[model samples]
Target chain A: SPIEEQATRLLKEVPLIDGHNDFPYMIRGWFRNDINGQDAHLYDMPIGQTDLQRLQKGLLGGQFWSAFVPCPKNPDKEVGSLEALRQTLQQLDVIHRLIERHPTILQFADSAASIWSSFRAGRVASLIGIEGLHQIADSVSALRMLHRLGVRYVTLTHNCHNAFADAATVSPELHGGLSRKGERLIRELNRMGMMIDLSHTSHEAQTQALRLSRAPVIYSHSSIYSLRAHARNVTDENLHLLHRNRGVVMICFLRELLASEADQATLAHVIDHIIYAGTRIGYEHVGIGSAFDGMLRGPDGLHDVSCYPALVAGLLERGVSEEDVKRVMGLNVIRVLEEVERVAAELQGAGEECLCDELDEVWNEDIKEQLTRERERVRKLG
Target chain B: SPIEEQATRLLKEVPLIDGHNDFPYMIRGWFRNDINGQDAHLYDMPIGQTDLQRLQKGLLGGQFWSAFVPCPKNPDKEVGSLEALRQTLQQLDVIHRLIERHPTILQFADSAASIWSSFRAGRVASLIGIEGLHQIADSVSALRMLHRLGVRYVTLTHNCHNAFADAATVSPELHGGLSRKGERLIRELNRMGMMIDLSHTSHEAQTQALRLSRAPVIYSHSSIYSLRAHARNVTDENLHLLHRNRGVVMICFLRELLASEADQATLAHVIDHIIYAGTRIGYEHVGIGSAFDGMLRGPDGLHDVSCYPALVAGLLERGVSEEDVKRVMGLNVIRVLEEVERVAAELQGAGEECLCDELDEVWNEDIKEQLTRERERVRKLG
Candidate 1:
């Protein structure tokens, strides 16, 4: 009980910022009046960790809500870019409506200043993040529209590789890493002040995006594969790169990432990853995302939103300083957000124009016809 | 201009009720913040046909949002029943949230009366229909849980046949049609008042389900394959059986279902199937369930939600009477909904229970082990 008490106290001192959670999804579920204050069937469970009630109870400082889209497997039915952009806007509207509906409980924060401002005002700072570039619809124009829609960050890819980037967890099949278009998209996002999230992207894409981006990128929610060999987790090399890029790695609470087995996912296991990542990247470049409500398989002792205090207590017992723990808890992510904003302001002052028109010129009817003619000519040769 | 006006008017009057639209899935994509609306570009677009805005423009009277969960392609990650159920609920929540957020524009209607009521109120009446029984998690309990979540119908199979039922679209590699579990699941859904939609079910499975179900079944959205020759479309014999069984056939708008060409699509081709279906099954048993939206490859005119009016105009010009037109328009679907509701009420009054205890019970650990052993035994024999 004393250990629990100590853990609770330490957790209270460390402000929490979850880099990614599909809470807007939960809100949509709740908003639709399907699962209310009392229901216990998975999506509707009243006692679940990530609902509005639980979020309020957790004393969370800020969060990034992911706008994710599924890629059609059939090559023909693969989603186009415009539809993806519209989908993102729709989700953004959902988030905006949620904030409007719960003004006292949550507020949208576009910059580090706004995030701290929301925390000081006792409101959860909500940040909007796109889960994949597929939503950009392959047009820089669409990307520009999304930037205007208040998207703070964009994850390059999910499980599948896209035209823009490859997934770090999986081997590349096409476009290998960042394609020419992907590079331009990253540069545009950087110019627009949107921080690039490299959580699900391939290592090559990450490196390319980091080099191409003027703003500091963030791994919204990922864990160290050095601790657990899961493809979804980042490697030690990635951690060092993120550190060098002045980005932050927000550790995820997924069981596969935090421990060898579900049973082994104790406070020590989580603290081990934090300590290791901190030793390599420094505490300033490390933080917690937890991914509590987003992940289906969470670490032992960290099943829901209420388990954050226990994690903080584990760090304190491991002799981690309160200041270092505080930085890892939330300050580090806020620092990255500020750095991104600074870069964005500089780009805005430059008044950079869009790169879409030039690309469209080549990708239009004339080029299409030329490509078709060339292909037919080759077929005739065969 | 008059032709266009007539086309628009006729399409508007058809009282469109797409039996299968993955609107919830499109919404899911939107939530994911994808770029394409449903175009080929893999980028965000200016517009798509099936959002709340487009649905209103299409004058879509009522629709069954199919809760489709992509089946696990690999046996290693064979999706568990619980996961399927959770995914279904999450999608269902998307529909509910859309309706709730746009209460002035959308409403969830359970019965025909409620559908008409919603129509009178000038809102889209949205309903949930599980696309695959595989999502039932092989648990009768899961079916009941789904019913409580407002699912009004269940299609026995999709493209892949499950342990319970066979898919009509694909040959049964192992069992011929209904597995013993499949038979029981059908009986249970009947007892629960949930309509059995036999769109993608195999011939053997359809025959068995028709015989087993107390209430009339439905081909919620399909075409006569004798007319188009695709595996997914229904056969001539199956159409006659549905008519005799008092079931209705909602003709599909998929170009492949209406024509044989790789790309060519015309209104006449669609009308040809409708005319054939009406002649064979009688106009009373025919309706429309345009499988528009999501990733469907169909004709140019029937490609999106806005094109519904043009199809309806074609039917009116072909001498479809106002009464017959009304039935095909939406009355036929509402009629089945009322019948299903009546049957469900009777079953509730009689306190009749589902035949299976939980759909999952049929696929319990013991059954899984048995399946494993059976596979091994067969492998050794090979």
Candidate 2:
């Protein structure tokens, strides 16, 4: 009871900013993006794990509501890729509307300061992130537009290989780590102040990005691979690299990542993941990332958004320091956002040219000569 | 021979602005958006008609390169819809690169003045348009961004229906004409200075939009339905309405729209289509919109871009006055652009809030009360 009280006190003091949640996609699947006159269903949903009332009960300080569309699955790859980008906008549109429509419960936040301001106002700080490079549809311009629309993070891949990076679960490694274009985009991501997300990326891709990124990166949702060997889990080597990069590994709540037999996974296993990561690197490099609504079922006792307080109490009981628990709760991610902004300012200040998808030459020399001659003729006539 | 010379003189004096061409899509189909060192293929051998040499041979002064992705063809309508938005960007990206990489042959233009300047400078004034509302992915924000990126016109629909309006080719019309959302968006389009194109839209949709649009609209590429009964053609009634709306009907060169017997279609039929509209609507309300690269086989003697001069000569031989010929070439569309911009300025100066897809409310009173109490507690604590 004393630990529970301390956990509640800590949650109140420091915002427990979640790295990822797929409530926007859930709204898409359930309501077809028609939230008009659907207040009751939104607050008391019969389907997904997330709901307005349950989210409130959790006392969640902030959340990166995942504006995630699925990977390109259409046989027509081009169509599939572009479709994801559109879906990304739809999700983002709903997320913004969700926050605006429920201003009392949720406040939109895009920066570290905004998060604190929202938390101080006792409203959950809602942020946005697209889940995959595939969602960009291979256009840097569209990706920049997404950033302009308040999307703070972009997961490198999501169960499928794209032009940029390989996913964790994919085979025959497309780029081995990152393609040439992917390497160039990393700089653009930093310059644009976008936090690079590496949760669904391959180990090699994560390692390369960790080393190359000018600012801190994040595994928005993942568990410890050493604890449970899964493609979606963070390997020990990658974890060490993440610590060196000053990034945070927000532990996921997917049962499969928590146990070999997913149904056998429990709250204790999730706590073990948190303790293992905190012990190996530091608690400051760990955070909560319950992939709620993305999964049909979560680990027992960590079933929904409302169960965050219980996890905090369990960590406190296991002798984790109160400050460290608070850091894992939200402080670490706030630091990452601040650092990402600072690096972007520095790079932008240095006048580094943004990466472009422009062509070099598409006309022959003879045609170029003819054009020059034509221009000269026009000038002479004038 | 004398008429041919006169036609050439008129074309040289006034830019022959084609309303729509799908060369960008051809590049996408033939090269997959990879133009890095394929100069010969781009200039010489092309699969479906548009090559740089042929374009030069046409002696055309301007063109609106269509950034058309197919209508939502995916079984999952959401995915199909969003995919189009992404494809729109890709096509737009390619079009810009095509111009930038060949500044000697082509110059990017988005205004009447820019078209004149490019024409005077002895280059084809390359402009841009998206062929369907589906390409916008139902986001007015994205549509505005498209305008910012130099899209001058937005065709209301392709062959598929969207949240906006009904397409001419689709049956059992959704919304009948312009939906409530579509009507609101027309104001936004006018305020944003986007040219409302009525090429593929249903007859009723075109009628509603033509009457509702604050500025002049355009039938970007359509034949006369009265001459050749087809869904994709402009009807006699619509043409009359277009005249009243001070709009231009740019006659298309599609063989199917030109003659019932597709193969029997010729450059003469195209000239006849142009003359019928020009005579009835007055020459000022008519222009040329060769849907080049959109069809596999164009009308005889007008098989490709190279045959534009022949069409011009045919118009002159068909007794169209030289001044009227010039108006039909490019002056009329230029006038529409100027007017569209003027209307946009007037509306914007009056401070019109753009249409938004925002929600009204998603939380009940009980949740609102709880949020208010929580905020009050925080304020008191502060």
Candidate 3:
């Protein structure tokens, strides 16, 4: 009964902010509709986790919706790459349409102040984070275009290396550090006031990114490797470096990283990681990045969006003070967002440089010629 | 009259052996047939280099057909990986079928002695080399499977890094070096009598592979980067190292690497690189990896298969003796293949450990599961 009371109290007090979640993917999968589909399917759930109704029920205030593009099937096939890009644009459009459709329940929030205001108004403040560089099609122009399309953050690489940077999973030869292209991308993202998310990038990439980026970055949804040795988790040195760079590391709730097989990913596991992250990185640089609905499976007792109260209670029982809990829950992320907004405004005033001018011009000319020749060739083949 | 007489006489005696070529792609493209299709196209116009008629006209005695699988578009799509593997097998099957269909014209040769005997008998000696690790689906078992299937060489990576190793086109983050999986793959290839090919791998991967492999590795189709600053070319240091390791750096006939943009690509450019590479890597380590039928656009005077004499004339003009030219043409590769066979035999007797066992097992099991799940999921989505 005491635990229940504590959970209820903490849930009401904490301003919860999820750093990363793939709710749009769930919407696409379950609803069979774009983000803007008016059908109730977007709110419908079978047995998994996180839906519009459930988020409202759980007192969720804000969440970063990931714009993840699946890699193409046959990289050599031109049509496949185009289709992949089209799919990503459609998904992004769906998210935008959804925000427009449910303005009362959800509000687009890019600034910390806007997020806090939306929370006060009892609306779920939403933000967009692009998950991979391949979506940019190896074009900085495409990256600029995505930023203009309301993406507030961009994760440099995912499970595989892209033209810009290497993923955590790849060997070091392809990308020794932040590639020249990667550094330029980071600088451009910084100029755009977009937060650089280093979740799936290699450790070497992260270091190079930090050195290149003018603004602080964030590990949007990463766990401590000291707790779990998954490549997805961040190391202690990385954690401290993030703190020194004035960046944030949002503790992820992915079971594999939170606890060993014995614990099977419980709220206690999450709380342990948060506490560990707090010790490794300063409390100011620690935040919650619950990968809700993004993971294939979740731990017991924290299976869905409505389980936040239980997580809060677990943290309280672990002796996290109310103030620290509040900061970890959402304030830290809000602080980072505010910083990003300020940097963005400064960048806009200074006017961003077009880093890919030469490459773009040359490539465009070549592409036009290639397309013409290919069209003729295909026609002849047909 | 002397030049014309010398050209005709030299053409008849040299018996050129191009180390690597991709005639299968032309068959696939022109005929719209898969590699194993019964009615693959072959023309005599020297329309593309390395075809049967062109080989006869050029006095080309033997060549290795590279089985190159482009990297899959979808990094997560299981079917994509499977499809790539299927395509490579189909290509290999096609080449074998071609050899079978024309036994009098062509014969399968695995060692230097066999190739020479076949050449003297006036038959084209054909060999096989898999171009990328993705063809093996990151499974060592697949490597063994391919070896048994008559694939004599495995290139560690292509233009992109795979689970095995990194490529020359480096990114910033994932550029550490050859992965544990890659190292093991190299070792396994060596133990299996499969010559390791470092054509498209990065400097780090090449160095690591050269050190890891007991057998002499071959840069199957690469040029000296000191002569040309292309990512596809190897550095001077790497060439020297390969020379010391008794590895071969087969000079490719791609125009871009052979000539500066101002000079324009020509048959003369091809011979220049051959002479330069021979000087840098030693005649023993230099061989031809002419990308016949692989180029969409080839250098002037070498657009199709019949242009072989023009190339020989260029070499003669450059003061390359008929004997040295013969080595550059194919003898170097034959010697390397024999050396590879000897090393492989020695390895067989020594009871050498298989290097790729752990990764091969893990990748096979994991990739199968992942691909199966992906296929099922995609099927449901469709």
Which number leads on lDDT? 2
Model-by-model DockQ, in order: 0.02, 0.08, 0.01
lDDT of 1 at A40: 33
Give the alpha carbon lDDT tens digit for every residue of A194-297 in model 3: 88899988877877777667788898999888888977888877876787778889888788777668347778778888898886666788888888766655
Give, for candidate 3 chain B, the lowest lDDT window spanning 10 residues: B355-364
lDDT (Cα, tens digit) per residue for candidate 2, span A1-382:
8888899999899999999999997777656666767789788775667889989988899999999988877898977887667667767877886886688999999999999999999999999999999998888867876776789999999999999999999998999999999999999999989999999999999999999998999999999999999989999999999999999999999999999999899999989999999999999899988998787667877877888999999899899999999999999999999999999989867866666555335445674465445334433432
Candidate 2 regions off by >4 Å? Answer: A358-382, B1-84, B90-134, B137-206, B210-382
Per-residue CA lDDT of model 1 for A70-141, tens digit only, reads 443435333344334444544665566456446787888878888878877888888888888777655554
Q: List the pairs of residues colliding in candidate 2.
A: A83-B83
lDDT of each: 0.68, 0.86, 0.70
The digit string of per-residue lDDT tens for model 3 on B51-130 reads 56656776677777877766778656554555566556556655665675577778987667777788778788888888
Candidate 1 ranges beyond 4 A from true positions: A1-382, B1-14, B33-48, B77-81, B356-382
Of models 1 and 3, which has the larger DockQ?
1
The ten-residue window of minimal lDDT in model 1 chain B covers B354-363
Between candidates 2 and 3, the one scoring higher on TM-score is 2
Question: If scored against the real structure, what TM-score would every candidate get?
Answer: 0.47, 0.61, 0.47
The candidate with the higher lDDT, 1 or 2, is 2
Q: Could you tell me the lDDT of residue B230 within candidate 1? A: 80
